[PDB]
Ligand binder design. Structure first.
Ligand code: NA
Length: 277
């Protein structure tokens, strides 16, 4: 799935922010869903389906959040995973895995159209692939091991949607990395909204049902990209609160928690976001 950007590219393509000059009280817990309750995207869990497009999902999800947050709720949109997945050439290999950083660069340079889930069939370019169960059982068919081919980049909206593809593009103004630093990540999320991040997947992650995840057993399976929405503490143990893109039947109703403050599975190493203004 998700792979790490070459460090020379990561360093040069965009700035890194740390918020060291910002002397704000950091609350012991924070949930983006609570701070911005009128931004409905923040509480929406998506499904990447049979496609290694986690990199695109973490991106368009955090971007849809930030469009609402940073406009004071004036822009309420659900950005197209398929448009980003199929059209960004510097982001990697579509359904065969991709890279986080360049997706935020792409949002700034070219922008991304609107588009809902397949089932909702709404916006310019809704997702073409159905919901399926990822490493669990539930109401959807199992994903299985087959992977869809990356769709071609189409540059046109579905028939019923009136705004032309180009004019439906929503662009960021800036993209950036966040410093590998717990307090910098917290400051970023509480001020500007959820961020995208990547982490190392071990075999025991695929058995996660509940609790604060930490890697205990099993070999590495690769990388995954997700959306960090807040943080908290349970019985003195600090965690990040994270939206996965494997639908609401996975994990804690689509979400999970993972150890915070110790770069667990490199969770604090590839944080990336950007701003609309
Ligand atoms: Na979707």
């Amino acid at each position: 799935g998700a792979r790490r950007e070459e460090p020379d590219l990561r360093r040069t393509r965009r700035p890194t922010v740390d918020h060291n000059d910002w002397n704000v009280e950091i609350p012991s817990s924070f949930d983006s869903r609570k701070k911005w309750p009128r931004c409905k995207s923040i509480a929406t869990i998506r499904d990447q389906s049979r496609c290694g497009s986690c990199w695109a999902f973490g991106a368009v999800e955090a971007m849809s959040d930030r469009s609402c947050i940073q406009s004071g709720g004036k822009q309420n949109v659900e950005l197209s995973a398929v448009d980003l997945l199929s059209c960004c050439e510097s982001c990697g290999l579509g359904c065969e895995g991709g890279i986080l950083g360049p997706a935020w660069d792409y949002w700034v340079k070219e922008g991304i159209v609107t588009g809902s889930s397949k089932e909702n069939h709404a916006g310019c370019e809704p997702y073409p692939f159905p919901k399926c169960e990822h490493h669990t059982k539930g109401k959807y068919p199992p994903c299985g091991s087959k992977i869809y081919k990356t769709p071609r980049c189409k540059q046109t909206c579905q028939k019923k949607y009136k705004t032309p593809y180009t004019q439906d593009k929503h662009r960021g103004k800036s993209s950036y990395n966040v410093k590998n630093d717990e307090k910098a990540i917290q400051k970023e999320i509480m001020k500007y909204g959820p961020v995208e991040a990547g982490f190392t997947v071990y075999e025991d992650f695929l058995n996660y049902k509940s609790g604060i995840y930490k890697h205990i057993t099993g070999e590495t399976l690769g990388g995954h990209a997700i959306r960090i929405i807040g943080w908290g503490v349970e019985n003195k143990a600090p965690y990040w609160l994270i939206a996965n893109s494997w639908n609401e039947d996975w994990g804690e109703n689509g979400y999970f928690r993972i150890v915070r403050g110790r770069d667990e599975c490199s969770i604090e190493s590839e944080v990336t976001a950007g701003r609309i203004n």
